[PDB]
Design a protein around this ligand. Structure first.
Ligand SMILES: C/C=C(\C)C(=O)O[C@H]1C(C)=C2[C@H]([C@@H]1OC(=O)CCCCCCC)[C@@](C)(OC(C)=O)C[C@H](O)[C@@]1(O)[C@H]2OC(=O)[C@@]1(C)O
Ligand SMILES: [K+]
Ligand SMILES: [Mg+2]
Length: 994
């Protein structure tokens, strides 16, 4: 292994002590293989059912539930073969919930897709190498490839490992690094070394990366690194090293069951001391075996009451339609839990070109020299029409229609655009729209020359298909192009060498046509061309040139500027070496500046308003772009990220600046910054780390495999629809339209869904709380069971679930996007609210136990010990003459349980309404605001009746229908809830804070 880009061909071959002619000997293989291991990415995490299903049963809330099942199961063996056939139903029900959720968990994981695994798709199975064994090439498993090995690659092949290119057999070698950056555009490679040791991947021109495809050509290369050491391998290591916190909610629930454990144990403690007087009891032992079962059956009934069994379902269901809901809005959410974190986002960093802008290019303005006389200097500024790539536009000076042929500056400028251009234009018949063939920026040049054909070749009659390339073709005829000097970032410009084709025009010999970044290329220009004539460059002219460039790049226009020039007297073709990019800058010198072209990558119509939403929403939006700081800042002010006159000095940074900054100042810039220009690959991961240092819930956009480590780091990684498969798998959500606004829209739902979800959760928790109290009162007083576990399940699973699900449909607040992002820390229930559900819970507690008691006594249908100690009901059979002048089996009766159950159900439908809003009275906030809630409420009651009246059910449940009169008692007991809450709902939004 090594940093082969900086090394020479000979150095690399020397390092490994390998011959380019023969390759590695079999011995060197043995040693190399042992030392460097195999050229493969590590294995998938070993998971098994037996390991999967146990994680299902390792949450506390599932363990105590499991434990409860056994007890009931055991208790149910003690049940007389006659006393109940259905004894075994109670334990089963618990288990089949635990089995059902267990089932749910596993299916989700089987489907879940790892991001690391997506990298493997880039691993080729085969590769071709040269070794000592054979003169002829051998095709082997990429896995068996070792560093220092001689490798052969050709078109179509997927690069097996990171390779230093030794020699290129083909005339030209092109590679497709789209897997990396997302760009389909091929790139030329060279043998000559890269001087910089820290050069970023993009600048390693003498390098081949594992996973990439060869666009064109054939080459021979030495293997620098393999397996984990490759660029892709390093990226895997970053992703493997990265760890993801649990959704804030998730974190809350874990502490919930955590605390719930303590509370549960505490209840038993208290329950035990309340009945401590039992030590001052007869030692006859009579009924001792009996007391245990009762306490045990109380324990299980307690567990189910404490836990909200139905909750898991209710939540996932709500998230599922919310997900489908977002899908309609072009927002694809993978993994439901992320919906919450999606509402909490405080910072969102979005790539410019892909999302924030259309990536649809067109030339708006352009200028050429008009007159250079002494200090006096004048230029010709033009304006072009048409945002589409479609050659349907007009050139106008001072808004007045112009025939381009009139100016000789334009004729030369136009030839440059067409000749120094790789991309073309194609017309598609199916969609009926003009489409770019190659690069967006280049395509708009081919587009321009059409609108301004300086030869005015007639094409109005030409078919639309033939129209697309007409005016370009004519220019391609004029000059034969010998070769081209591709773009390199050092000089930031590209050139072409052209022999004048044909005898009629065969004059002035060969010429060079260069285009690139204004600053760079203008320094090389020693002359300026006015019309046909040419004049030596002077300060004053150069200034007037650069001035308009700044105005166009930094001004309201925010145009990307290209400087077009020609080398009138290029060097002799023979003196030129075309295999080294380093010599390119010296070829492009002594140039004659013809004119510049300004083009725009227009922001999306939806963006401006979407940015404002973030201001209103408290969300900080950070832009990532490729433009130079100057214009980048300009674009920010154009979409509202910055005020036109707002100071930005400390809020805008480039990769260079950021790197120069010390760690402290770096972290500091992150909280301030809203614009990063010319960013390096590592930064995205860094920025996220920093934003997370301030506990910011951050969103990141990525398209390629390099962005992956970042998307997996950021709280919410966002990938494009056009994005690579790997980018998608690492992200939390994918933008189908790639539109930025789609991001903002998702956050709105993220907040909206969470609010309703918050309500139905408290609603379910509250019912639990109340159920625990009843059970506890039942235990402390020694009362007979008001509620049986089986019943509770039904209530928590179904009766509570439906209104809870309906609550998920609550109409959204109007100020959702006017409030700052929710604090992940903030608890669901605290302070006053906690006290509320504390009180309410108590009410339902007393209500249920009391309703069952009111039947045992003071009831016509039931024989009552009015205000007597029915409590000692354990001792009836043995102690019946004393106080028990009646049958003792009466305590088994269902009527009291149904009475107690019924009141619960009714109270719960009420409490559901009180949950329509946290602090808003129902007259202020009717129940009819949400139709579904009322609709679901009716449903739950119907079902409640069902279990009472249909033959098989009431028996199983231990319920019997109650007289109309008995029903009324329920109402007198349950309905008062709304009043209670309304009052606690009248203290807050008035006398408390708020
Ligand atoms: C039945 C449910 C049981 C036990 C149970 O939920 O127990 C407590 C508990 C985990 C919480 C408390 C409960 O306190 C009691 O109900 C005290 C009961 C005393 C009983 C007396 C027996 C002697 C909640 C529910 O209570 C109320 C309404 O505010 C509020 C809120 O959700 C939580 O504070 C929650 O823990 C958290 O992390 C929060 C932020 O979600
Ligand atoms: K994550
Ligand atoms: Mg990128």
């Amino acid at each position: 292994m090594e940093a082969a880009h900086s090394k020479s061909t000979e150095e690399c071959l020397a390092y490994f002590g390998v011959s380019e002619t023969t390759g590695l000997t079999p011995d060197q293989v043995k040693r190399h293989l042992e030392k460097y291991g195999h050229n493969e990415l590590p294995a998938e995490e070993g998971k098994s059912l037996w390991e999967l299903v146990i994680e299902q049963f390792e949450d506390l809330l599932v363990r105590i539930l499991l434990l409860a099942a056994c007890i009931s199961f055991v208790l149910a063996w003690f049940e007389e073969g006659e006393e109940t056939i259905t004894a075994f139903v109670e334990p089963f029900v618990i288990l089949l919930i635990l089995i059902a959720n267990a089932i749910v968990g596993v299916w989700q994981e089987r489907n879940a897709e790892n991001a690391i695994e997506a990298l493997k798709e880039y691993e080729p199975e085969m590769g071709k190498v040269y070794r000592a064994d054979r003169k002829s090439v051998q095709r082997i498993k990429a896995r068996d490839i070792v560093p220092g090995d001689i490798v052969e690659v050709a078109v179509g092949d997927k690069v097996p490992a990171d390779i230093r290119i030794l020699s290129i057999k083909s005339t030209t070698l092109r590679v497709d690094q789209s897997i990396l950056t997302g760009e389909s555009v091929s790139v030329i490679k060279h043998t000559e070394p890269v001087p910089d040791p820290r050069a970023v991947n993009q600048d390693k021109k003498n390098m081949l990366f594992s996973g990439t495809n060869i666009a064109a050509g054939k080459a021979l290369g030495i293997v620098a690194t393999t397996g984990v050491s490759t660029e892709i391998g390093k990226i895997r290591d970053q992703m493997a090293a990265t760890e993801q916190d649990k959704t804030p909610l998730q974190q809350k629930l874990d502490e919930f069951g955590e605390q719930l454990s303590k509370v549960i144990s505490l209840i038993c403690v208290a329950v035990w001391l309340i009945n401590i007087g039992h030590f001052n009891d007869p030692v006859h032992g009579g009924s001792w075996i009996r007391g245990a079962i009762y306490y045990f059956k109380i324990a299980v009934a307690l567990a189910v009451a404490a836990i909200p069994e139905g909750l898991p379902a209710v939540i996932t269901t709500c998230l599922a339609l919310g997900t489908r809901r977002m899908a309609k809005k072009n927002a694809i959410v993978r993994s439901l839990p992320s919906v919450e974190t999606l509402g909490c986002t405080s910072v969102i960093c979005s790539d410019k070109t892909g999302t924030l802008t259309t990536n649809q290019m067109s030339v708006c303005k352009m200028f050429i020299i008009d007159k250079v006389d002494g200090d006096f200097c004048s230029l010709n500024e033009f304006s072009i029409t048409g945002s589409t790539y479609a050659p349907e536009g007009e050139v106008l000076k001072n808004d007045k229609p112009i025939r381009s042929g009139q100016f000789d500056g334009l004729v030369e400028l136009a030839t440059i655009c067409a000749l120094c251009n790789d991309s073309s234009l194609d017309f598609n018949e199916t969609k009926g729209v003009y489409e770019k063939v190659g690069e967006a920026t280049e395509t708009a040049l081919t587009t321009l020359v059409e609108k301004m054909n300086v030869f005015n070749t007639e094409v109005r009659n030409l078919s639309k298909v033939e129209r697309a390339n007409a005016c370009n073709s004519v220019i391609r005829q004029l000059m034969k192009k010998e070769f081209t000097l591709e773009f390199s970032r050092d000089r930031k410009s590209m050139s072409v060498y052209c022999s004048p084709a044909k005898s009629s025009r065969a004059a002035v010999g060969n010429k060079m046509f260069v285009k690139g970044a204004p600053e760079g290329v203008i320094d090389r220009c020693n002359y300026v061309r006015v019309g046909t004539t040419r004049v030596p460059m002077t300060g004053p002219v150069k200034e007037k040139i650069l001035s308009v460039i700044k105005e166009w790049g930094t001004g309201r226009d925010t145009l990307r500027c290209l400087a077009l020039a020609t080398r009138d007297t290029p060097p002799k073709r023979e003196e030129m070496v075309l295999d080294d990019s380093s010599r390119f800058m010296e070829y492009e010198t002594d140039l004659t500046f013809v004119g510049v072209v300004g083009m725009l990558d227009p922001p999306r119509k939806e963006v401006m308003g979407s940015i404002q939403l973030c201001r209103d929403a408290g969300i900080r939006v950070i832009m990532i772009t490729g433009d130079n700081k100057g214009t980048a800042i300009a674009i920010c002010r154009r979409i509202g990220i910055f005020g036109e006159n707002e100071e930005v000095a400390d809020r805008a940074y480039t990769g260079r600046e950021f790197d120069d900054l010390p760690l402290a100042e770096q972290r500091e810039a992150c909280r301030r910054a809203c614009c990063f220009a010319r960013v390096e690959p590592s930064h995205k991961s860094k920025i996220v780390e920093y934003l997370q240092s301030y506990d910011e819930i951050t969103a990141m956009t990525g398209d390629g495999v390099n962005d992956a480590p970042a998307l997996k780091k950021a709280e919410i990684g966002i990938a494009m629809g056009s994005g690579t498969a790997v980018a998608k798998t690492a992200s939390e959500m994918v933008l189908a339209d790639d539109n930025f606004s789609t991001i903002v829209a998702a956050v709105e739902e993220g907040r909206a869904i969470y609010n309703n979800m918050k309500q139905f959760i408290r609603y379910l928790i509250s019912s639990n709380v109340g159920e625990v109290v009843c059970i506890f009162l039942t235990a402390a007083l020694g009362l007979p069971e008001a509620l049986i576990p089986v019943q509770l399940l039904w209530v928590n699973l179904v009766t509570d679930g439906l209104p809870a699900t309906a609550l998920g449909f609550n109409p959204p607040d109007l100020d959702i996007m006017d409030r700052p992002p929710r604090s992940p820390k903030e608890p669901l229930i605290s302070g006053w609210l906690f006290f509320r559900y504390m009180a309410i819970g108590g009410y339902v507690g007393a209500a249920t136990v009391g309703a069952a008691a009111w039947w045992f006594m003071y009831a016509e249908d039931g024989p009552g010990v009015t205000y007597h100690q029915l409590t000692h009901f354990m001792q009836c059979t043995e102690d019946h003459p004393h106080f028990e002048g009646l049958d003792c089996e009466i305590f088994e009766a269902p009527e009291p349980m149904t009475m107690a159950l019924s009141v619960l159900v009714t109270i719960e439908m009420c409490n559901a309404l009180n949950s329509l809003s946290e602090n808003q009275s129902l007259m202020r906030m009717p129940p009819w605001v949400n139709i579904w809630l009322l609709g679901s409420i009716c449903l739950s009651m119907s079902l409640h009746f069902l279990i009472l009246y249909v033959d098989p059910l009431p028996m199983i449940f231990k319920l019997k229908a109650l007289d109309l009169t008995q029903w009324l008692m329920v109402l007198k007991i349950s309905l008062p809830v709304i009043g209670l809450d309304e009052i606690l709902k009248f203290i807050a939004r008035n006398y408390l804070e708020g």
